[PDB]
Amino acid sequence: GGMEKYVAAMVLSAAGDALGYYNGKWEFLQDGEKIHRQLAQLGGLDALDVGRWRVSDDTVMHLATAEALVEAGKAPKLTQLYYLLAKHYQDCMEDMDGRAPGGASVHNAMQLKPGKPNGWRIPFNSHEGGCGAAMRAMCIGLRFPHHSQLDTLIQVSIESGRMTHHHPTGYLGALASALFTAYAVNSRPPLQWGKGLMELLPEAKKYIVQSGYFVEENLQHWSYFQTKWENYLKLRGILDGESAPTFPESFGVKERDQFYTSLSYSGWGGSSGHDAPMIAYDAVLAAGDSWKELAHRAFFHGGDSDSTAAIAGCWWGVMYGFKGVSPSNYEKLEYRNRLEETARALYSLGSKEDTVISL
């Protein structure tokens, strides 16, 4: 069985979010060395008890995606799944006290018209490249992990994303988040993941054209995400997807902050759809089976650390379960029971290969 990997995916995504958020305290700080100092003072990662560390918007929206997928059930109509996603995204705004939700997410969640034909579609917008689509998409790969479902994974990740983030930098982050989760479910070596994404982007672009909404804008803005990813994979020596990655000789906390800023759009690494999954991926590649290593690279840094953490913790949980994770990092986590229940339901659906009714 692999059910514990689904449970770890949902629970450790949320634990990562909570750890990388610290009730909004890391953001006053916005400095990796200062965060790691505070971490040490609190007793290091294994000492942290998340009982009073609330999850943020990332987990609220990830749960919204997951609950919509579960409610849609077996062999769903995509019209019904998209109604349910839009409804869950709009309704989850009620749970945002203290959670610092993002601009595009909030604005567009309020505009959706779940129940109306194409009611969850919004226009293209140049400013919709934040990481809010990426942070909430991983469980699409839990639901649709089979090779036979790859077109569905593409479509659902993109459309879930562009309910709030109608810009390729935004929604291709959702594709990466979902796709790498499916890769992890299938035990695909992480060194192969980037190349897999690059090879699939033409099929994502095909879907955008065939779907037919804002084709010109979407295709004219595509190069940012694709170039960022190509360049990142070349830097790590993994564009070929058949070689282990190589890291800089000097790559401690301060160097990682400078690198994350180098990837970023507006100065804060991980705040966009391209770089949130990229930083999570960089952390996965370096960390292997070490939760602590993962945390030190993806949860504790001066950028958008709750959001890189939410993605990284999900992928890592799928691969490694709870091995080496201090129980205090999740035992009293907000929504733990709910996350577990949803994980089990996703496992029931995902582990059983099925076929959707496409649009």
Ligand SMILES: Nc1ncnc2c1ncn2[C@@H]1O[C@H](COP(=O)(O)OP(=O)(O)OC[C@H]2O[C@H](O)[C@H](O)[C@@H]2O)[C@@H](O)[C@H]1O
């Ligand atoms: N075209 C673009 N290309 C790249 N980055 C962009 C673009 N447009 C905006 N950005 C970046 O998008 C950032 C603004 O993203 P926001 O719309 O506020 O949020 P969200 O809806 O995505 O929600 C996710 C976040 O909100 C919660 O705090 C979660 O924890 C996440 O951190 C800008 O600062 C830009 O760098």
Ligand SMILES: [Cl-]
């Ligand atoms: Cl630590």
Ligand SMILES: [Cl-]
């Ligand atoms: Cl709960």
Ligand SMILES: [Cl-]
């Ligand atoms: Cl609970």
Ligand SMILES: [Mg+2]
């Ligand atoms: Mg957040």
Ligand SMILES: [Mg+2]
């Ligand atoms: Mg964030």
